[PDB]
Design a protein around this ligand. Sequence first.
Ligand SMILES: *[C@@H]1O[C@H](CO)[C@@H](O[C@@H]2O[C@H](CO)[C@@H](O)[C@H](O)[C@H]2NC(C)=O)[C@H](O)[C@H]1NC(C)=O
Ligand SMILES: *[C@@H]1O[C@H](CO)[C@@H](O)[C@H](O)[C@H]1NC(C)=O
Ligand SMILES: *[C@@H]1O[C@H](CO)[C@@H](O)[C@H](O)[C@H]1NC(C)=O
Lengths: 126, 50
Amino acid sequence: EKSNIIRGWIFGTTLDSKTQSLLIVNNATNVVIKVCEFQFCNDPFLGVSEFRVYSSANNCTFEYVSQPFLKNLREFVFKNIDGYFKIYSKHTPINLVRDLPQGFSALEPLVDLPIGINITRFQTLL
Amino acid sequence: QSYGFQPTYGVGYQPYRVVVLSFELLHAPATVCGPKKSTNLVKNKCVNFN
Ligand SMILES: *[C@@H]1O[C@H](CO)[C@@H](O[C@@H]2O[C@H](CO)[C@@H](O)[C@H](O)[C@H]2NC(C)=O)[C@H](O)[C@H]1NC(C)=O
Ligand SMILES: *[C@@H]1O[C@H](CO)[C@@H](O)[C@H](O)[C@H]1NC(C)=O
Ligand SMILES: *[C@@H]1O[C@H](CO)[C@@H](O)[C@H](O)[C@H]1NC(C)=O
């Protein structure tokens, strides 16, 4: 996590006016989860304003609002089973500065979303 | 063609608002339901709980 320049997820199967696509962004206000379909860019840099990640919406099926996801570690698990998407999380300070330390930390589920769309790829934003 | 609506027109030609609601069959996780029950609670008795 540290200096970050992270957060921003773009999932989906197709890349051209087909199916839908998930989108998760953190802005210290709301972790919005828009399944709405748009077109995108290569490296859309928002914030400090400008907003040009999406291109055009057609129609959407889910809108969500929840609380923000806050030597640390930013750990997530994204898993989909029979139309239910599950995103887990964990955040804990560590002493080692090198790599993943030696220890155990289970993941408390944060949300369950019934959607029912097949997914094949994803990309991280900055 | 435009309707002709007047307050003095006949009841058959009077405007009527019709709303038709249609629900799709069970092919996806259920998203619409309703309040079933609002019963109270008891303690230290033999009861059937749901
Ligand atoms: C953080 O992002 C959320 C989600 O995009 C923003 O929530 C919106 O807030 C406006 C303010 O009235 C509402 O009209 C919208 O409906 C909300 N949702 C969306 C999807 O736009 C929130 O405002 C953002 N916070 C900051 C500080 O920019
Ligand atoms: C709405 O969603 C359907 C998904 O079946 C898609 O085929 C269509 O292109 C979308 N847009 C419109 C305007 O119908
Ligand atoms: C695409 O999604 C549909 C939705 O039910 C699913 O039936 C299908 O198996 C998915 N495609 C793949 C390749 O998994």
